[PDB]
Design a binder for these strands. Structure first.
Lengths: 58, 356, 109
RNA sequence: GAGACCGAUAGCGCACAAGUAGAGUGAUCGAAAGAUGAAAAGCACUUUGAAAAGAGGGUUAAAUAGCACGUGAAAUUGUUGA
RNA sequence: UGAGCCCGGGUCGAACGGCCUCUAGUGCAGAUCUUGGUGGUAGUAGCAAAUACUUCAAUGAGAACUUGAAGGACCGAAGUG
RNA sequence: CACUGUCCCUAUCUACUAUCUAGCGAAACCACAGCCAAGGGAACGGGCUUGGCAAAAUCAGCGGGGAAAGAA
RNA sequence: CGAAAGGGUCCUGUAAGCAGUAGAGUAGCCUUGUUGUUACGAUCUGCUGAGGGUAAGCCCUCCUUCGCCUAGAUUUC
């Protein structure tokens, strides 16, 4: 799923370290080969962008 | 190093052999000449010295002593020997009935799956005719042999070792006609022999064992430097050594329950250190207190035998009086001899109050 | 006596990780746990929980706890033509203190 | 058009997709490499193996001619026999 | 006598030999010979530094070094961007 | 003037190796070979003489041998 | 036989938390304080020779608990 990790980074506008793929839906991610098929799985919740790491200034 | 111990190789057998029994004369009383024991560890004693001419005469000296655990050997056999131009030859070995499973473990390398059939037919010749094969073989020893030996083995259940295989050794009978020592050997069958009867207090004895092994080392520690004579690397340790003139300071009974008690300290305690001997356990049998260092590691079988010659020193004719025996912890800087006077010194603890 | 049995054990890793190189203690503790369940259940097929791997690596690579307390569950490997017919699954359990606790069988019912 | 020439380490460096491949910044330097069978008839089909391949079966006069292909030495190697 | 000559047995498939003369790029153990091939050494020397890997699942005939997730480390904007 | 393993006098601890396994895998060098002693005129043996001897196949260390001036 | 546990023996040095105006000090209330109050508060003391570790090459086990065991391959007169 390296292609899906790279394309999700471009679709979600983040790095590959913030792209999260569903461990239980690897068969569904694998069929997604277009930027529209990944945009499906972002909306459905199977590909999720992680937030920024905590950087407490206090 | 010494060229006398030149073949610096590992010892051929773990037990180690006597290689020389004392020279025998028939005018002496009948007695055995060697025994076996297990190395427990060492302690500290105070002896009230009586050495006329010494600077420590009639003073207190602190000495290091070695404890060897000695369960009573069981006599199971009798081996006769004849003189030959080629040397000395074994002519006849006579065993007894009811051989224990411990010595039977010695004749097997896999006891757990064997059928344990050793000496099964030998048990049948004691009741075959009337014992004709047994009596014939003893009469062969009486009329042909020049010196006879006794097969005795130790018991491992009395000792705190995970081993179960007994150690079987030949012990020479000295002092009598060949007829007299044979009647000793047959009468001594199936019978435990204590170390109280073999040896005695205030006696130099000869200690035989295999030393501590160190594996492959270089010339820095194998020879002691800054063909055979050239210092070369190899095996150090696990060598057979015979040590000479070690005094028996005490022979404990094991029943007495005041083994470490002297006439001057009246504390009812045993020889076992407070917390146990490190890597050995507890000594619950007869023990021999040997002055000084003694070869072999802890748990190793020790072979003790009589001195070959009459002694030429006043150190052998010295009566040993002990003032106190250390019983404190070998496992650290122990300042307490018994459990009772540690709680007396410490006072009440938190766990003692919650339990009571 | 049953093929399916779950028991809870305490592993004294302090005596199993004594003197080991500091940078191999957390990897070796995983192998010693696998060696523990292989001996205690007779099964060469041993699987460790990912959260058990979290407990071992909690204090870094050289900070393995002295005593961990786990549950080893022998279950039947059905599969299809499996090499071995049984496997053991090991999970860390939640206790106040992994000391003073005897080995015990846990009832599924 | 010929030869008392040479016959694939020989004869031109080149009997072959040879002044090629390759080397050097460049001037330049510069190889190795021919042959199943009369005819591809170059293993249909079956079986084992993930595959490569192997075993049956088949083609041929010859698979002791399997495109690692005419004949197939020695060095060196394996198995069996003494 | 010898350099050698001749026959038997197996392999192979297209040309070859005796005799008298003629002719020559005509006979090898060496040349630290030329080209090509093959050994012992030898399953031997050895397969570095950049601290560091681990668990479950998927794919696959086969997974330490292929992927997903989760732990443990790192570059630290003069970057391993 | 002070300290220090420089030494008396040396011991101990850690990492990578050295060791073993799986996979991968060279080169130097190579007439044939490798136990000693005495003798072998040419101060030259390893092959000869005549003695000591002498028993398969192997695994690790070493620091000896299988190496060396040339004569005005 | 093995894994835990309990007790012993050693090593370190008094755990987390709770409580006492002992407590230097920092601050709000109303008014004179000759004995004014109210909160926070380093530090100290007690629970506490406590707490942690303990064989990996320490010792023992009275039903201390749980588990395992007559395996299976080769070779031999």
């Amino acid at each position: 799923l390296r292609t899906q990790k790279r394309l999700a980074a471009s679709v979600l506008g983040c790095g590959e370290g913030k792209v999260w793929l569903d461990p239980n839906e690897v068969s569904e991610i694998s069929n997604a080969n277009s930027r529209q098929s990944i945009r499906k799985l972002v909306a459905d919740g199977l590909i999720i962008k992680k937030p920024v790491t905590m950087h407490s200034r206090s | 190093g010494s060229l006398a111990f030149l073949p610096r190789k590992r010892a051929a057998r773990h037990r180690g052999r006597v290689k020389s029994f004392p020279k025998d004369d028939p005018k002496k009383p009948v007695h055995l000449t060697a025994a076996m024991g297990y190395k427990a560890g060492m302690t500290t004693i105070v002896r009230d010295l009586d050495r006329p001419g010494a600077k420590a005469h009639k003073k207190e000296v602190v000495e290091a002593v070695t404890i060897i655990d000695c369960p009573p050997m069981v006599v199971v056999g009798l081996v006769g020997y004849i003189e030959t131009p080629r040397g000395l030859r074994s002519l006849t070995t006579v065993w007894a009935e009811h051989l224990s499973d411990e010595v039977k473990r010695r004749f097997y390398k896999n006891w757990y799956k064997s059928k344990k059939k050793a000496f099964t037919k030998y048990a049948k010749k004691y009741a075959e005719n009337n014992g004709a094969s047994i009596t014939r073989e003893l009469e062969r020893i009486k009329k042909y042999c020049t010196v006879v030996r006794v097969l005795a083995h130790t018991q491992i259940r009395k000792t705190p070792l995970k081993q179960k295989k007994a150690h079987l050794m030949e012990i020479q009978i000295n002092g009598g006609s060949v007829a007299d020592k044979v009647e000793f050997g047959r009468s001594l069958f199936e019978k435990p022999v204590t170390i109280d009867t073999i040896f005695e207090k205030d006696e130099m004895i000869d200690v035989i064992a295999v030393t501590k092994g160190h594996g492959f080392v270089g010339v820095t520690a194998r020879w002691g430097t800054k063909q055979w004579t050239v210092a070369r690397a190899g095996q150090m340790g696990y060598h057979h050594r015979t040590s000479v003139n070690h005094k028996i300071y005490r022979i404990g009974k094991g029943d007495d329950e005041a083994n470490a008690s002297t006439e001057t300290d009246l504390t009812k305690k045993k020889i076992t250190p407070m917390g146990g001997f490190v890597r050995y356990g507890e000594v619950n049998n007869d023990y021999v207190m040997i002055k000084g260092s003694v070869p072999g590691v802890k748990k190793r079988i020790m072979t003790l035998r009589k001195s070959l010659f009459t002694h030429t020193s006043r150190k052998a004719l010295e009566k040993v009086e002990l003032k106190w025996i250390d019983t404190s912890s070998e496992f650290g800087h122990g300042a307490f001899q018994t459990a009772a006077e540690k709680k007396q010194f410490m006072g009440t603890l938190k766990k003692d109050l919650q339990t009571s | 006596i049953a093929d399916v049995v779950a028991r809870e054990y305490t592993i004294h890793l302090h005596k199993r990780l004594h003197g080991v190189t500091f940078k191999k203690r957390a990897p070796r503790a995983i192998k010693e746990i696998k060696k523990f369940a292989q001996k205690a259940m007779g099964t060469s097929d041993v699987r460790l929980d990912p959260q058990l791997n979290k407990k071992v690596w909690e204090q870094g690579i050289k900070g393995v706890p002295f005593r961990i307390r786990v549950r080893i569950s022998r279950r039947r490997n059905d599969e299809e033509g499996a090499k071995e017919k049984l496997y053991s699954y090991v999970q860390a359990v939640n206790v106040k203190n992994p000391k003073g606790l005897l080995t015990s069988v846990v009832e599924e019912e």
